[PDB]
């Protein structure tokens, strides 16, 4: 067995903490047991893990999960809402070959929404579910019980885990609600990374990232807003404040409407990055295997496919996907004594109404 602690910091996450404990084999069952928890400015999460890598003779794995999650939207630079949830997952893992692995799973989740600040897109979803709370009050509540089928595919032919120089990684996750669930929706996510070395020593590398998300409702319902996609921040479009890209909340009056600069995400998202990895200037070659400099061009968009620009023509068309943000800047990664570290300075040279900027972004990782 083993156990571990983690301290991190991020511009978007603040000071973060992590810990866990795992029994490699639980009393000869053949299934490893684990307890893991993390906390940052906007999230508290804990889970119980129960997995066996050899459920069949030829590699297929079986995994169990039992989790609790608390989420403060305003702390994640979104319009205010609170989501307290818990659930379980059963996941099968199939290694297809050396570079590919598939996984299929069944999931249950209970979502408890509270403290929701009335806004158009959020309430529109609530209307699609049959919920019609006050538009002047922040003391509301909404609860759902959902069952999901979860697909997954991972390609990984990266030459190396730390600081890749060659190869690609692709991760595709989908999920759909099983009938009987309160919600009715599907949701798909795609992440790609491609490293192309342009020199024989592999010090000069071209990196191309893409990140995609699409989800929508079935049966006339919408996808829950707390399943939305986001963009902007240290890990998507640098130089933009975390999650700022895309629609903004159109608030209902308190006790007519108000345009805001508070991001709410959306049910569709596209992000791409072209990054040029070089040797690190102003640092010795002794410290080359532990540092990575790069110059990047980031772009992304987030939109709301169900935004009704007819009913709300006085405000920007948040269903429009073509308002593509862009930034350029320089980044520095360092395997420090304090763990994995990342500086980045970026100027958002193409921004839009409400987009908040954040030139300097910083992250110390807590998991390695």
């Amino acid at each position: 067995g083993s156990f571990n602690f983690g301290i991190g910091y991020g511009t978007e996450s603040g000071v973060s903490f992590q810990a866990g404990v795992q029994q490699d084999n639980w009393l000869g069952t053949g299934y490893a047991v684990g307890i893991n928890g993390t906390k940052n400015d906007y999230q508290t999460y804990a889970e119980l893990s129960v997995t066996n890598p050899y459920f069949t003779v030829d590699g297929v794995s079986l995994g169990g999960r039992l989790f609790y999650n608390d989420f403060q939207a305003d702390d994640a630079d979104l319009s205010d809402y609170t989501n307290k949830s818990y659930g379980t997952d059963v996941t099968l893992g199939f290694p297809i070959n050396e570079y590919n692995s598939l996984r299929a799973g069944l999931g249950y989740v209970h979502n408890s929404l509270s403290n929701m600040q009335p806004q158009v897109a959020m309430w529109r979803y609530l209307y699609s579910m049959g919920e019609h709370p006050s538009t002047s009050d922040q003391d509301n509540s909404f609860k759902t019980d959902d069952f999901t089928f979860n697909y997954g595919w991972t390609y990984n032919k990266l030459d190396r885990g730390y600081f890749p120089t060659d190869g690609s990684r692709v991760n595709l996750t989908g999920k759909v609600t099983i009938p009987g669930s309160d919600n009715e929706y599907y949701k798909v996510t795609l992440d790609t990374a491609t490293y192309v070395p342009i020199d024989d020593d592999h010090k000069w590398v071209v990196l191309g990232r893409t990140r995609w998300g699409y989800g929508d409702g079935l049966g006339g319902k919408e996808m829950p807003f707390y399943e939305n996609f986001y963009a902007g921040g240290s890990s998507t479009v640098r130089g933009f404040q975390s999650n700022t890209i895309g629609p903004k909340a159109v608030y209902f009056p308190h006790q007519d409407l108000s345009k805001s600069d508070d991001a709410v995400g959306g049910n569709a998202m596209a992000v791409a990055s072209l990054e040029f990895i070089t040797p690190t200037p102003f640092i010795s070659d002794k410290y080359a295997n532990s540092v990575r400099t790069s110059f990047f061009w980031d772009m992304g968009t987030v939109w709301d496919t169900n935004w009704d620009s007819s009913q709300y023509s006085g405000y920007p068309d948040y269903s429009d996907p073509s308002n593509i943000r862009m930034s350029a800047g320089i980044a520095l990664q360092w395997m420090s004594p304090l763990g994995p570290l990342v500086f980045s300075y970026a100027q958002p040279f193409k921004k839009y109404d409400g987009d908040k900027a954040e030139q300097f972004q910083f992250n110390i990782g807590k998991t390695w």
């Binding site: 067995g1 083993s2 156990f3 571990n4 602690f5 983690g6 301290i7 991190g8 992590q18 004594p337 304090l338 763990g339 110390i364 990782g365 807590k366 998991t367 390695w368």
Partner: peptide
Amino acid sequence: WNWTKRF
């Protein structure tokens, strides 16, 4: 940073 100790 991440501290890890095999018990």
